[PDB]
Each structure stands twice: as C-alpha cells, then as structure tokens.
Amino acid sequence: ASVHGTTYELLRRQGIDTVFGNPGSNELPFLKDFPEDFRYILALQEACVVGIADGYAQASRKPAFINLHSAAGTGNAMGALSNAWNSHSPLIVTAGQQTRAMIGVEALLTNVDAANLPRPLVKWSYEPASAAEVPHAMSRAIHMASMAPQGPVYLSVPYDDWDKDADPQSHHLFDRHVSSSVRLNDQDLDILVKALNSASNPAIVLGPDVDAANANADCVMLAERLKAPVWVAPSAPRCPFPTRHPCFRGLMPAGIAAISQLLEGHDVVLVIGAPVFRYHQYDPGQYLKPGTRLISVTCDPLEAARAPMGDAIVADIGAMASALANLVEESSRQLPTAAPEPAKVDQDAGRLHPETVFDTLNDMAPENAIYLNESTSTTAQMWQRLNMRNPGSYYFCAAGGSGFALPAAIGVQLAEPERQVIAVIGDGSANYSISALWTAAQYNIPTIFVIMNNGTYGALRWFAGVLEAENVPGLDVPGIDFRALAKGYGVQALKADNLEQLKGSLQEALSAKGPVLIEVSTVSP
Amino acid sequence: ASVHGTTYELLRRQGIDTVFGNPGSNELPFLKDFPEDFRYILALQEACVVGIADGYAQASRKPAFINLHSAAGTGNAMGALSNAWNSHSPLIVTAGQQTRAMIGVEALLTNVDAANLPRPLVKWSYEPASAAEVPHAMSRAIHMASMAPQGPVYLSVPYDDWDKDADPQSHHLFDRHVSSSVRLNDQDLDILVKALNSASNPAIVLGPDVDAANANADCVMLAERLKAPVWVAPSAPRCPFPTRHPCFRGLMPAGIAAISQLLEGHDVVLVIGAPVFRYHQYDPGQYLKPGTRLISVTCDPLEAARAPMGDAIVADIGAMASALANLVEESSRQLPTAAPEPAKVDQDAGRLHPETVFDTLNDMAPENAIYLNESTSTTAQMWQRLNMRNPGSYYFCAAGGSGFALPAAIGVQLAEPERQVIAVIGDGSANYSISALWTAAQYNIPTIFVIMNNGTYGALRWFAGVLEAENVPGLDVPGIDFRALAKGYGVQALKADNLEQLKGSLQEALSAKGPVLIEVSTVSP
Amino acid sequence: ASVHGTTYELLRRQGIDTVFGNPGSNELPFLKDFPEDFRYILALQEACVVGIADGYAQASRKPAFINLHSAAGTGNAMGALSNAWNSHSPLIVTAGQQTRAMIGVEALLTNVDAANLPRPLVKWSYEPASAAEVPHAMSRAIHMASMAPQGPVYLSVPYDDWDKDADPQSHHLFDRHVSSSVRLNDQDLDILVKALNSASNPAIVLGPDVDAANANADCVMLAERLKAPVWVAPSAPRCPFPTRHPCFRGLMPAGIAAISQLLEGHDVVLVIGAPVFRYHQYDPGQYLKPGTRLISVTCDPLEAARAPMGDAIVADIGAMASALANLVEESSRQLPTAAPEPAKVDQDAGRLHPETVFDTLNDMAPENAIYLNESTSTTAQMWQRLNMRNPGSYYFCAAGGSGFALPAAIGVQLAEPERQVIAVIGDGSANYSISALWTAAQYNIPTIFVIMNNGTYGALRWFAGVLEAENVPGLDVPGIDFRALAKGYGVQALKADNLEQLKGSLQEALSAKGPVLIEVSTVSP
Ligand SMILES: Cc1ncc(Cn2c(C)c(CCOP(=O)(O)OP(=O)(O)O)sc2=O)c(N)n1
Ligand SMILES: Cc1ncc(Cn2c(C)c(CCOP(=O)(O)OP(=O)(O)O)sc2=O)c(N)n1
Ligand SMILES: Cc1ncc(Cn2c(C)c(CCOP(=O)(O)OP(=O)(O)O)sc2=O)c(N)n1
Ligand SMILES: [Ca+2]
Ligand SMILES: [Ca+2]
Ligand SMILES: [Ca+2]
Ligand SMILES: [Ca+2]
Ligand SMILES: [Ca+2]
Ligand SMILES: [Ca+2]
Ligand code: NA
C-alpha cells in the first residue's frame, strides 16, 4: 500500500470523512484520487477553512480535518487557530510541504522550520522524518487533537511522501482506541461530594468544556440537587446551561472585583469546565471575598495551574459532571427562583436597538436554533434575550478574534442540518472572513447571517470613551454594502431598516431553502 | 515624558509617519492622542493591513510600521508575513498585549508566548521586560527591520506600558544612524572585477534585491559594459531590469535542469540580489553544466549559505552593483541583440486570452505604470508582454502566497501617487484579501484592479494535468460576482466580456479619479 | 510583603523546604535572607545540581526545587533535563535573570529569549512580565511540575523582582490543592476488567511510572489475581516490581521484533506506566504477532498518542493500578513459577567479571538497598542478579544520558537516609558528573559509589563490533585514577582488583559513616 492509501484508511477508521481545505500544489499528491467516501469542503481563504472546520468540530463534538497550503496557507489560518486553542477545538491541521529533494535549497513553497510556524497555538506540531512515518504521525495528530484537553495540532507533509510505500506494520494504527474519559478517584470524589452536600450556600459556574462534553443535562441535575444558582464563566465561548432554567443567573462580568462581589456570601463555588477566570477588563480587587472558597474541575492542566485561587481537579468534564450529579444529596433548600424576563426597550419606527433584534429573533426562531455571536458590543443583551434550552446553542470566538462566527456558522450548520443556525455578526467583524459566504452558497448550507450594521467598531469606541481616550483613529467603518457582498458570493440578501422590515426579512429567511444574509440597520452607540 | 510620547518621537525621528493598522482594545492606549503629524491607514482584516504596508515599504524603499491586535490579529497576518520574509520587506509589526497585571492569569486577549507566535517568519521578535524598555525595544525593531538583509520584525507591548514614565536616557535613541551599506574589500573586489573582465561569455542573473536597492540602472551599466545577457532569477518578486533593453532575456524557468541548460556555454554567471535559486517545480538535473561557474552577490547570509553551487559575497546590493558597474572594463564584444516582440495571439470576439489582456494593457497604460501579478497561470505571458522601463514596476507574492497583490497594490499606489498602479489578479487569488478594496475606496487611493476571471484555480489545474492526477477536488471557483464585491466595498466596477469592452473599460479606468475594478472574462485553461 | 517573602511562603506552604543550587549574582537577591527552615544543597556544576535534585524528587515522590545561574547555568544542566523529561521527574528549575533595566542592552548575564532555552525538555517555561507576578508564576511552576504527567518546568526571574512589593492577593496561592488522581470512568473500567478476566493467557508489562506512583504492591496483587507473567518495559528507568516474585520475567529487550516474539501467544498484554515502547536497537519486525492485543494505561498523553499499536487509557497510574487490582477476578490458572537463580560465572583470582560484582553486591547489601545503574554494558546482568524486593530500589538514566547516576545517587540517599544507596557506574560514565562527589563529602551523604573500571566505553565498543564498524575513534578511556578523584573531592576511596579485595572493600564501605568510592578492576569486553 502507498502512504496515501494507508493514511486515508487510517482517517476513515478513526471516523474522519470530511476534508476542509484550500488547495495548493504541495497538496495535490494528497488530494489526487480523493476517496469516494470522503467529502471536500472548499473555502476561499484559510481563516475561513479553519473557522468552518472549527464550527463543525465544536458542534459535532469530534475532530475535524483540515488541509492547507504550506507556510502562506498555514499563516493565513493562525488567527483562526488562536480561537481554536481557547475553545479546545479538536482540529487536525495538515499542510503540504515541498518535495524532500528541494527543501534544502528553500524552493518556492518550502515551509521553513514548519513545526515552529503555528506554535504556540497548537498542542503538537510535527513534520515526519520519512515518508513511511507519515501514517504514524497522522495517528499521533488524531489522538493529540482528541485527548483531553482537546485542541488543534499541526502536521506538515512533503508532497513526495504520499506515493511512497507504506510500512506494512501501519495497520496496527487503524483501530487504536485512546481514552481520556477519567474522573477523580473514589476516596477524593467522596470528599468533594461531602463538601458540596455540606455547603450552606453553594454556587456553580460553568464554562465551555461543559457544552463540549454534552455535560449540560448533568449540570442541570447537579444544580437542581444542590439547589444552587448557576452562572456562566466570563468571555463565554459556548452556552453550558438552559438560559431560562430557574437556577440560571447569566453571564458573569469579566472582571476580578465584579466576580468576587458576585460570589460574596457563597461558601463554596464549584467551577466546571472553565478557566478560572477568563477576565477581560482590568477591574482590580479581591479574587474571592472572605468566606468564599472555590473548587475547579477542568480538563486542562494549564487552566488548573494558572488559577490564582481555589483547589482544582484535572479530569474529563463529562465523566465528572455525571458522577457529581448522581452522587450529591438532594438539598432541602428551596430551588432558586427564575430570573425575570428582560424589559422591552422603547423602539421607534427607525433604526433598530440591538435589544429589539434579539427579542424578535427569540420570538421567531425555532426553539432548537443555534446562535453565533460576533456582535461585540451587544453580548450582554444577547445573553439576556435569547432562550437557549438545548446544548450546542451558542458560539463566540474563544480568543476574542473576529473572523470566527461567519465561517463557524457554516460549519455548525453542516454539523447540525436540522437545527437552524443564526449568526449575529457586527458590520466590523463581518469583514474578517467575508469570503466564507461563498462556501455556504456553493454547498447550499442554509445558515442565516444577521449583520448588525451600526457603522463603527462599537465595543472599541465604548472602551475608548471609558478611558477618555481622545483622538483614537480607525474606529469607524462606513461605506460597506453587505447585500452587495452577499450577492458577490452568491448568497440571497435582504435589508432591514426598521422593525417591520426586520420581521419580514426574518420570515423570508426562515422559510428560504438556502443561506440568507440580512443587513440590519442598528442604532449607533 | 511618557513611553507613548517618547516612542512616537523615536518613530518620527527615524522617518516613520504612517501607521497601517486594524485596532483593538490592547492597542487603544498606543493609538490615543494619535499625533497630528502621523497618518493612520485602516484596513478591515490583518492580512490586508500587512499587505498594504508591505507594498508601501517595497515601493518606498523604507520601513513601514504596522499595529495589530494581540494574537488573533497577529495570527491573521502570518500568511502576509510569509511573503514579506521572502521579499526582504522592512516591516515593523507591533501588537498590543494585555496589561502586565493580567498576563499571568491569561485574561482574554493575552498573547501567550507572544514572541514565538510569528516565528519563523521574522528577523527579530520580542516583548519588553518593562514599560521603560519599550522605546529601546522599538529602536531595536526599527534597526533590525532596516539593516540588510531587510525583513519583518515583531514587537509585543502590554497596553499599560504607554502611560508610564519613559527613561530620560531614551533620547539617545532618537537620531541613531545605522548603516549596512557595505561592499567587498578592494583586494577581493579587484579579483572579482578581473574575473568578469576576463570572461569569454558572461551572463548576469538579477533578483529582487536589485530593485529594492534601486540598483537597476547600475546593473544596466554593468550589462552594457560586459556586453552580457541578463535574466531575472526565477519566482521573481520584483523586476530588476528594463524589459525591452537589448540585453534582457526574461524570467528564468524555476527548474534546476532548465536553468543549467539555459546557462550552458556561459563561463561565468554573476547573480546579483537573488537566492540561488528560487526553484519551484521539481526538474532534477545538474545545478550547472561543465564549463559554467557561478558567483553570487547577496545581501542575505542565509541565501549565501544555502546556494548548492558557486561562490558568494554577502554585501549590500546597491553598493556592490555601483562598484562593479563603475570598475569593469568595456568589453569589445558585440552588445546582445534585443529579443523580438511577442506574437499576437489570435483573438475572437469572445472571452479574452490572457495574452490579449497583457498586450492591451501594454498599449494603453502609461510608460511609468506599476504592475502587480497574482494571476498565477499567466506569469510567463505577463513578463513577455509588458514593457517595464523603470524601477519599481512589478510585484509578485515572494513566498507564493495569494492575498498579497490586492492590498499591496494599494500600498504601492500610496507610495507612488504619480505612477498608475494596475494589479492583475486571478479570480481565485482575488478572494484571499478582498476586503482590502475598502481601504482604496475610503482613502481614495486610485489603484486599478484587473480581475482575470476564468472560473478556476488555473495554475493548480494545470499542475494536476501535469501529474495526471485525477479526481482532485476544490479546483473550481464558480459563482463570484466581482462587480458586486467591488460595490460592496465602495469601488467603481466595470466588466469586460470581450476585447471591445476591455478597451472601453481600461479607458474609463485610466481616466477615473478613484480606484476601479475591472472584471475580465478570460479563457478557461 | 515582598516578592521574596511571599515566594518562600508559597514554597513552604506547598511542601518545598530544600533548594538544590549553584549560585550566581542574578540569584543573590533570591538567596539572601535565606529562610531558617529551608536547606540549601550546593553542587559544583549544574548537571550535578539537577541530577541530585532529580534523584531526590524520584525517591521522595514529590517535587524538587532547583536554582541555577542564568543561561550558562541553565545550559550546563540541559543534559540532566533530558533525563528528567524521560523519567517524568517533577523538577522546578528556577534561574536568575539580569535586572529588568539592563535586559534590553543584553548586559553580561542576561538570559536572552530565556523561556526558549530549555525547550523542548520542559513542560512549561516562563519569565514573568512583572515582579508582582513572580509568586503566581512560581505557583504555576509548582503545579505544572506536579500534575500528571509530572516533569521539569522552568522559571526565569529578573533579580530586581525579589525586593519589590508583592500583590496582597497572592495569599490565595498558598494553600491551593491541585489533583490529577483520576481513573477511567466506571462503565469503561468495567469493560477493561471484563477483558482482563476473560483473557486466556494475559501478560503484564510495567514501566517507571508504576514505581513513581508507588503502585508496585497493587501491581503485585494484580499479577497474582490474573496469574500473569510480569515484565519490565525496555530501557527501564526504575524498577516497578519485586524481582524475585514468581511472576517476574525480567527486563524486556529493547527491540521491536524481540518484544513481539516475547509476547507471542499472550492474548491480552496490559502495559501500565510505560511508553509503548522505549526501543533502542533497530530490530525491525512486527509490533505484535497475530493473536496478541495490547492495552496501555499511561499518565502521559504523548505516550498514548505515539504508541504504534494497542488501545490506551490516559489516567493516574496509582489510581488505575489500585482500581484494577481490587476489581479483577482471581483466575483459577496456576500462578507462574519463579525464574531460576542465575548461574555463577567462573571467576579466577584476577579482574572481576561484572556478574561476580553483582552477585557479591546481592550477597552483602541490605535487603532494602537502593541501586543506581550507569554501567552501560552490564545492565542485563544487573537485572538478573540483584534481588530488589521493595519499591524505589533502582534508577537508570531515563534518556540514556550519562552523568545521572553519580549525582542522583546522592539525592536518593538524601531522600532515603535509612536505605543504603549503591551506585554502580562505569569508568566512562563516572566522569560526566564527577564533581558531584564533593556534595556527598560536604553534607556527609553516605552513598556508596562502585566504579566498574574496564578502561573503555564498553557498550559502544560492543555496538561497533555489532556493525563491523572499523576504525571508530574515541572508544577508550585509559589513565583515570578514581581513588585520586575521590580524594580530590574528599570521599574515602578503596580499590578492588580481585574478589577478595571486592569483598573486603564492600565490608569496609557498608560499615563506613560517610560516602565511599570503590574502584573495581573489571574484565575488558
Ligand atoms: C482579528 C481581530 N482583529 C481586531 C480585533 C479588535 N476588535 C474589533 C475591531 C471589535 C469591533 C467589532 O466591531 P463589530 O462591528 O463587529 O461589533 P460592535 O460594533 O458591536 O463592537 S471588538 C475587538 O476586540 C479583534 N477582536 N479581532
Ligand atoms: C494563501 C494561498 N493559499 C493557497 C495557495 C495555492 N494556490 C492557488 C489556490 C492558486 C490558484 C490561483 O488562482 P487564480 O484564479 O488567482 O489564478 P490562475 O487561474 O491564473 O491560476 S496558485 C497557488 O499557489 C496559495 N498560493 N496561497
Ligand atoms: C551524556 C552522554 N554522552 C555520551 C553518551 C554515549 N554513551 C557512552 C559514552 C557510553 C559508554 C559508557 O561507558 P561506561 O564505562 O560507563 O560503561 P560500559 O563500559 O559498561 O559501557 S554508553 C552511551 O550511550 C551518553 N549515553 N551520554
Ligand atoms: Ca461519494
Ligand atoms: Ca459595528
Ligand atoms: Ca495632520
Ligand atoms: Ca483563475
Ligand atoms: Ca534551620
Ligand atoms: Ca567502561
Ligand atoms: Na510561530
């Protein structure tokens, strides 16, 4: 067998059947004779390729496979890899290298010092020392991406390797099963359960690894037994809990002092599946107030090590959430009362308040919709106004890098063909990965893109007002016609300048048979 | 003085007056109180920011200054940095970091292990250990980018540093002059000149560092004295010689055997300002034929070290080209005869042959036009058909990474406001950095963009036919309306489906007062 | 509080009370006012410092703390770090940096690009962005070294940081408890137990992480229940099983074909706490024979990913070994029969055969002796001839790097003051870290060093005969007087030229009150 045949056999035996890619010449010997049982999803720029694959991996809860062109293609994808690193996304990034005979002379398209290029944003990065090693290196890539804490990996392959003979012993790779589905030992788990059972006023904080593990329902059971309020850890990349459940208390503010104040009076705070904590604004104060202790369950040693407070347990979130939910006592305390509905903001017949947009989406969207957020100044309102009952209902760029939601919404829609995906993206953010629209058109992936057009980088302008920073350049983005961009890439486009038109556009988009972009005129901040 | 005030003083004292950027919150404390004597050029995605800055630096022959947002912004620019590394472009890339007080906890927007992120595509990469060190680190960045061999550098700055007090001794940085304008010592230069004077059939090969040095006219004098044919080294990022001069012999094929055959019978081959050589296709054979010896003058130790043949001299290209041109004897050999004009290809009233497009551009464009090439299957025809008399008339992505020409053409047009820039870009390549169009519209930078629309990644399809590689996916890019994309970003757009319409569109574009995009329907390969 | 006071408080609160070091000026502000409750162990060269700390950490089963001088001191220790990486040794390596005000100018003793220096041989490597961050960075170092898979970490600290004010919120670091004591979830553990219970002819292979976990007794119970033979995985850094237990089958040969042949006929092979596998010689063949399947339990994702065959479970070895031992059925198969005693090799009145040396050590040493091996050509005989009943009885350089055993034997003796340590070291290997002897003399650490003097690098000469490699230079090491080296560093020294003198020397060494070196004249290979 060839390296090509053996590698595709390994991929299919490990559950991989789709290649997300933007091709180049170093990749042609890999992509030739493409297997009939695989799909290739083309995107027009590599940030788009990786974003699509990332949404697909996060929604599918399985690794996604990517093929990029040498250094330039890898490099164009590194902002997308920064988000994937923070979301623990299991991405297998492969890039073609020059033929081994011209690497030394640094022929055009040689990826020099290849494994160092995507560092520090990958868990493992490698170029094999020989063609026969390629299937084994691919096996390592698959398992490194997939083991907890999941994350992106990188493999560079010289193009001449694919046609070489494989090692006949590579068959031992095909059916390897590697598990990291582990939980704290019985004695120490009993100690933790007793601490939870004994708490007078526990609180629960959940992060994105809960939703990645599909541990959401177990965390609902845990919160109901402990009769505990539940937040979402700050800068949230996913939604780990039903947002109208009576225990739910919303998205935590991303500040040190704000969080310790929020937790004041809670004697034990159990954090599951989050860094402690992804603060953002600088809001100095106490990490925790006197009387509060914190216990973190994380799948990532790096998170456990860097927490500035609390105890930690490094284990699989699915296994731990299930064990805790099934072991804790039912507290005799009263179940927390649900948060009240958000108020309706006054809305005239002109430009839309973001609050109006979210209320209308909540009214019209199916109950199993999936939302993506890259409307950076409206996140708080989004979290208050969308009832997200189900797992896998929310994604936000985990490293804060714009350019994620537009392509990721296409990958999520590919992963979840029966759940309507609605990406809510600011006019600024929409540009970073605008060409991803073409993939939705070409493959007829029926994502709805809602562009919140307020003419400016609103979150930045707000923070500049917050610093009394005058004379900051580059904050306005006038003069972009998003319906024309959509037409450019073959996506149906609608405009909503007021509420009547927003409702009409959403009705038209929800009944369409393909992707739709709606440009919404929103109120300037 | 503050670190902010001292750093902008250093920049202006070192000749920097423009910031190319896409802003974020870690950068607001740098950009606030932006000096009135500086310009900020916004682009909508970081590959675009860096591409614009790169074209500006290459055309201006001076460093360009860039400001990007943390890891995600840096990462989005790394494909652009791969081209800048290969073109020796002097780019000072700065990125904002989190405040020093929250780097440890890895708050959102922390750039983890920052200096390793752009490696291996930068000459120097650094984050200062304290705020007071920032001006000195900026000084290092300026000089590292600017010294031969020029190239991109990276500086990460925690946002809280800018408001801190500067070291009063930083004033010694402001007027430092650092020179690498050096040439081979007299004794060894005399030996080289004698070898050139004695050659029976010399040949000259020129690379991009000639055009970067503005050594073009000196190389014309050198070739006229030696009565020697002149090529352009393969995979050429720039044009180092007038393409209708009688000595000119065109772009070398990017293959080992092809080049040694081309050079057969030449006893001494002098290469100036190029790697030896940027081969591309694998075309194995002799590096040089018996009877040919090679001497390379390069500004880059890495090029001298990796050449598989020949002697080398590591020195400044401007200084060496001037010295050689003025020292060699006038040979009594006959001056080479000019290459004949290219033939006219038969053209019907339908879709355009690329040859027709280049002939028409050559007929209509001003004699001091500047061309950019990202039409990957038509490069040979472009080089045969455009008379480029002047320095700084041609740019092509030096690492082969698409996404360079569209933004770089805007930066070149900014650098050369009196020379009409015409970017010739394939329909595939146009997407990588499509949002750069907005910058041309906003700042009214009058670049002309000629999109060669043949519906496919033609160079890739050709190479797949060359390998008899069947069943390669992802090679076609149907369904893109480039006039709508242009309208989306505010650029006037025209379509040319035949020759009459091409001539009309070019006449309209050449007389326009702003940027123009022309979508040309070209013949499918 | 100062950074100095806060950091020592964190160290003591996390169980650290000893600093292994070789001091320099960047370290004086850390070491000044050294706390009265800490000990400082000086060694004369940094390979020695780290080797001592490594033996201490491995024998104590807890992290050891090291302080080295800048780049040169760190660099002198990197061969020792290569061994520590392979043995999963929890080492906290700190190095002093220049004052932040002179890092930029690269003053003498600046550690440039410090965090990259020990890569790729550390789990985490860091220099803090400010003085107040130092305690938090130290906390990260402590936990990263200590979490599974344990390993060395690196922290660089500018010398001016220690006297600065600490952040008052650093107190939250002091009592953090971080656990990785995890095991496979119940459902999948039940599946594994059923597979073991059902096996017709199981085999067990144990690696060093068993001994690190003190899982040895649980593995004895497991092997007795399964009635299974037990090997030791190849290139063994530790001894994980009593070597005279009836199930024990010895050290596996470090070859692919040899191991698959050894395992032939075993239907299920359970590997615990080892890479799969640390082969050495190139012995190509089948990884496993038909009929054998392999299941690996490892604490290290990198081991699980790179195994070329088998299933894997990534979990804590202590927790998994205990769970398996207590869950499997008692098989009705007959318990394996003990291996026969080794034969006595014929020995005349001249130079000693290594077999004689090991038999005599086994006869004379206490039953709770601890052995170290750096006598590279005699490893097989050592494993056959020493009865090691207890955990923590054997250490061998895990990456194959000589220079480990001499210093590590001092650290092990410090960790285990009531167990006599006997290091058996070849004459070649003894030189790499010879100055470590001084530490044993100064602190009166009563290690016994047995130098096997055969005049040559015997393992290398053997492998050169194996390749029929003629004319290899550098294989002989004549002319070293080890008694004089011992006297040089203050250690009592004895010589044994024959068996009578070996017995007399060992009797004298075993009754001595301090360290003793015995130079043994062994037979040339
Ligand atoms: C790749 C990248 N570049 C730059 C930024 C900086 N940035 C930018 C430019 C934001 C503005 C987003 O504007 P928007 O139109 O999408 O939304 P709002 O108007 O609601 O802020 S938010 C933010 O963090 C970024 N996060 N990611
Ligand atoms: C960033 C990036 N991604 C992918 C490629 C691979 N690639 C691609 C995709 C080419 C096709 C360009 O298509 P085009 O329409 O611009 O021109 P032609 O049809 O004349 O080839 S040429 C080439 O090397 C690349 N060079 N750079
Ligand atoms: C730091 C280092 N340098 C070089 C070697 C190479 N090497 C050397 C030089 C060996 C010879 C050891 O000689 P010895 O006297 O200690 O033992 P034998 O005579 O029993 O081989 S074994 C081996 O792998 C090494 N392992 N480690
Ligand atoms: Ca099919
Ligand atoms: Ca906006
Ligand atoms: Ca001005
Ligand atoms: Ca094309
Ligand atoms: Ca004391
Ligand atoms: Ca020896
Ligand atoms: Na990198």
Side-chain angles (χ1 to χ4, degrees), chain A residues 435-453:
Chain A
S435 66
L437 287 172
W438 184 82
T439 301
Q442 287 296 311
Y443 296 99
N444 202 47
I445 298 166
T447 305
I448 296 168
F449 305 91
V450 176
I451 310 305
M452 303 285 278
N453 189 356

Side-chain angles (χ1 to χ4, degrees), chain A residues 21 23 55 91 101 107 131 147 166-167 184 191 269 298 310 321 324 403 496-497:
Chain A
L91 301 184
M147 286 177 296
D167 177 355
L184 187 61
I191 290 167
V269 174
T298 168
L324 291 170
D497 287 330

Side-chain angles (χ1 to χ4, degrees), chain B residues 250-271:
Chain B
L251 177 65
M252 297 175 102
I256 290 161
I259 283 173
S260 62
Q261 185 52 65
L262 188 62
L263 297 174
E264 187 168 24
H266 288 291
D267 57 333
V268 179
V269 174
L270 176 65
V271 185

Side-chain angles (χ1 to χ4, degrees), chain A residues 22 28 33 75-76 78-79 98 102 105 107-109 112 120 279-280 431-432 438 442 457 463 470 478 481 488-489, chain B residues 22 28 33 75-76 78-79 98 102 107-109 112 120 279-280 431-432 438 442 457 463 470 478 481 488-489:
Chain A
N22 179 265
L28 302 178
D33 301 331
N76 278 350
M78 287 175 55
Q98 260 281 12
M102 294 202 295
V105 70
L108 194 68
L109 320 180
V112 174
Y279 304 114
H280 179 4
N431 305 293
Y432 289 82
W438 184 82
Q442 287 296 311
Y457 290 143
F463 184 50
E470 301 183 286
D481 176 345
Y489 286 126
Chain B
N22 179 265
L28 302 178
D33 301 331
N76 278 350
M78 287 175 55
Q98 260 281 12
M102 294 202 295
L108 194 68
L109 320 180
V112 174
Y279 304 114
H280 179 4
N431 305 293
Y432 289 82
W438 184 82
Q442 287 296 311
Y457 290 143
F463 184 50
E470 301 183 286
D481 176 345
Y489 286 126

Side-chain angles (χ1 to χ4, degrees), chain C residues 101-260:
Chain C
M102 294 202 295
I103 288 172
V105 70
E106 299 186 8
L108 194 68
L109 320 180
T110 300
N111 186 353
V112 174
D113 201 21
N116 281 333
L117 175 60
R119 298 184 166 135
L121 302 179
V122 289
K123 295 180 67 173
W124 186 69
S125 190
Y126 191 70
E127 183 170 290
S130 67
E133 187 192 351
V134 167
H136 179 244
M138 186 69 75
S139 175
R140 292 168 79 178
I142 293 162
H143 296 304
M144 285 302 290
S146 301
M147 286 177 296
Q150 295 188 320
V153 300
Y154 186 73
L155 182 62
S156 172
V157 181
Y159 78 70
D160 58 318
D161 286 356
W162 299 108
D163 289 344
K164 305 296 188 192
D165 293 342
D167 177 355
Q169 288 295 300
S170 294
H171 71 88
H172 293 281
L173 304 168
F174 291 156
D175 293 329
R176 299 191 63 228
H177 185 269
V178 176
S179 179
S180 48
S181 185
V182 299
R183 47 90 153 174
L184 187 61
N185 71 75
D186 289 355
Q187 175 163 108
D188 293 335
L189 181 59
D190 284 349
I191 290 167
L192 172 57
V193 168
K194 177 176 179 187
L196 295 173
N197 285 343
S198 306
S200 54
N201 189 23
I204 295 171
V205 177
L206 304 179
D209 299 312
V210 168
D211 189 54
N214 194 31
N216 314 45
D218 286 328
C219 289
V220 169
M221 176 169 181
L222 179 65
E224 289 173 353
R225 289 266 201 258
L226 296 178
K227 311 279 176 68
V230 173
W231 288 264
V232 179
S235 303
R238 299 178 71 145
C239 178
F241 206 79
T243 64
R244 287 294 175 274
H245 185 279
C247 294
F248 192 66
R249 294 293 179 266
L251 177 65
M252 297 175 102
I256 290 161
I259 283 173
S260 62

Side-chain angles (χ1 to χ4, degrees), chain B residues 263-339:
Chain B
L263 297 174
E264 187 168 24
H266 288 291
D267 57 333
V268 179
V269 174
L270 176 65
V271 185
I272 307 176
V276 175
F277 288 114
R278 195 81 72 183
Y279 304 114
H280 179 4
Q281 61 261 28
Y282 187 52
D283 183 23
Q286 297 159 285
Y287 284 120
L288 298 169
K289 298 285 194 179
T292 299
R293 74 184 186 94
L294 183 149
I295 306 168
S296 166
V297 177
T298 168
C299 62
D300 190 344
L302 291 169
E303 287 177 358
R306 73 179 184 261
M309 68 285 200
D311 296 331
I313 296 154
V314 181
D316 180 81
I317 300 307
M320 282 294 286
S322 178
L324 291 170
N326 286 290
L327 291 170
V328 294
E329 288 173 344
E330 166 97 355
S331 173
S332 62
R333 295 183 300 274
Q334 294 306 125
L335 189 73
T337 299

